Design a protein around this nucleic acid. Structure first.
Lengths: 57, 70
RNA sequence: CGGCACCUUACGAGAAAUCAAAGUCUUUGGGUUCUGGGGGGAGUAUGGUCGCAAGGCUGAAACUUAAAGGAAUUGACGGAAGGGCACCACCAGGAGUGGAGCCUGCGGCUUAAUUUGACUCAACACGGGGAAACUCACCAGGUCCAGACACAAUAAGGAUUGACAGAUUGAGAGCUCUUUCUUGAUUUUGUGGGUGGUGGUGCAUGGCCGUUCUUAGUUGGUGGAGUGAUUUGUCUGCUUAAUUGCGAUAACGAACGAGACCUUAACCUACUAAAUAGUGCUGCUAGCAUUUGCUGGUAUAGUCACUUCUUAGAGGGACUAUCGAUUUCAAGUCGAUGGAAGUUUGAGGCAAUAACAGGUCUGUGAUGCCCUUAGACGUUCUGGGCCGCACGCGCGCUACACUGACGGAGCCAGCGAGUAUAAGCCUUGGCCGAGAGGUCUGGGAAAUCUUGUGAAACUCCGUCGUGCUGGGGAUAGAGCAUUGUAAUUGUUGCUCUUCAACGAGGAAUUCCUAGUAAGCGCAAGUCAUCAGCUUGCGUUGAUUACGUCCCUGCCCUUUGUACACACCG
């Protein structure tokens, strides 16, 4: 999260502005690349067919 | 807050600043002339020629040099 | 067949609550009686009538008033109910505070001024607010423009600048005055207009911070319910520190908060290393006994080795792991064992939605509007004040002693900080001085020097001997030093002398569950000087719970409400 706060000068008085922009963790080139509690599990490599017991010398 | 800020009362009288005194055509009475033919001058190395003293109580004093003699 | 009812539905009705009639009513007509027409005045007055009476029946008007009222919704509140929770709650206790003296802040009073903000928690050692000057905003006085710029005027035959000597002034301010000298179109004067302000308004604001409330809470999409406000999701039960989980399920999928996370503490003879850490050896060497021993100094060139202790990257480790039990046997929970660690392992940083007329305009060259702007509310200098004292209050420090005071001796931490042509940093060692301090050197911009910060409580050996006593050290006299331009209204330190109150503190009331409380110091912040204050840090190290909802509050559900400025209604 990066934050910018500015003062706005108006004829009646100052207005305050706050902008908060959250970036994508996956697009973070500096520190962490994911949120701390975000868990990624790999896709399975299963439902495969197996040939009883040959050997390739 | 401030209790109806005091309206100044002045024990002393109104005081007046100082303008510059006038002296018409000073160089006229600076120099002496006779037909068909002057106070003093500062001798300090600050200015040199072209500065006039005054005639106080037997005392001299210029203005471009704050020095007194005799 | 008749009757007293009930349950479900809601086609239908209704503002809804609800209704088998309160349905068959704008698609408005089966018969018929009675009653109402905003709220009050008022079922009052008057007349009549009935009554033994009490009263009953009939029954106005003047005048007054913008709502009153019904049903439901969300919240809030309840001396309502049911669940759960907290040492800013209690219980069992510890230390106390409240009582004294003093330090400090607040009110009051005084004042020339004693600047000012804040008043339950959530004002009162708070404004980092320990003010001699400055700070500084207040008070008595004296300067200066640092009033941009554009006009207009004056004016070079002078717009204007300063300053010797006196007088003058607190002042060696040419501020002002006598004085003729100096300088020269940057300036002076009037207009327009700027600028500054710790001036006002925090009830005009931004930002920040505090609080509600540091609990478990908060929100939309689509779908379901409701004419609507709204509601379900977001929940009976069990469980958790937890809206956190198991699950239940008119929802389903999600978002925030919680948790995860980050910092820090504890373990690692497991990696990488160390001449700014430490060590084993080895030279050279000390004293003491000679067994080849015991304790040391030394060598950052000893052209040695190493990493247990120290440092810090890069990792490992805890996940409730094992075993008994119990419980939807799901989530969990309780005992042991092992383990450095088994309360989420200990401590923190971070922290949702809605809000408050909470605080701050005196942090800000953050600001709108108002005010003021040359005898200034700008700025600066001198001096005073913020400390002023019949009195009330808050945070504290010293104590009232023998579990002690004094004198000797022993002798152990941890977090930290530090400068140069100064306006001057941390200071070892040597010398002088009773001390406080002075002086000369040298090290250190720092794991290198200060510094093993040799801290204080504490431990040992004596003196004192139950008394306001050698407990306590306020108040005061005299003297010596240091900081500062300046110590008077004692800045602070030191020496002698003076030697108060206080004998454990009424009603009340605070904080706290383990390396915690209490006690004890140290460093850093403020800082020329000054710490009885804060923020951290270690040293010594407990008593008592490990529970509850009685008090004070908090969360959720049900329920009542004539409350919504929300019971301080």
């Amino acid at each position: 999260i990066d934050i910018a706060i500015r003062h706005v000068l108006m004829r009646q008085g100052v207005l305050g502005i706050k902008v908060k922009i959250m970036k994508d963790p996956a697009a973070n080139r500096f520190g962490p690349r994911a949120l701390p509690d975000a868990v990624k599990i790999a896709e399975a490599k299963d439902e495969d067919e197996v040939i009883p017991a040959p050997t390739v010398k | 807050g401030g209790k109806k800020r005091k309206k100044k009362v002045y024990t002393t009288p109104k005081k007046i600043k100082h303008k510059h005194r006038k002296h018409k055509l000073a160089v006229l009475t600076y120099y002496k002339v006779d037909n068909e033919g002057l106070r003093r001058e500062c001798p300090a190395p600050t200015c040199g020629a072209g500065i006039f003293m005054a005639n106080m109580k037997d005392r001299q004093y210029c203005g471009k040099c704050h020095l007194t003699l005799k």
